């Protein structure tokens with residue numbers, strides 16, 4: 001038996017701005033009532049931000065414009081979409097290497 005294993009590596013891109021404008025056209029907005037992610041167009045993203053507050057019922061849609069409705073995408077999809085680290089959790093893992 002020629003058992004063989006391996007693993008990946010660590011590499012990514014680097015931005016030059018603060019976390020306040022992800023994606024290209026469409027943007028991501030969180031509800032200030034139920035705390036749910038909502039994808040909106042760049043056309044409304046520059047209009048709903050009049051009070052720094054957004055809600056489901058405030059959404060441009062009709063079937064997905066309400067706190068009673070459901071989410072548009074999964075946390076995993078959103079996390080990978082923006083490239084953030086959703087779900088803090090214990091976060092317990094190896095790190096013997098430490099910073100340095």
Ligand SMILES: [Zn+2]
Nearest residue numbers: 031034056067
């Ligand atoms: Zn909501």
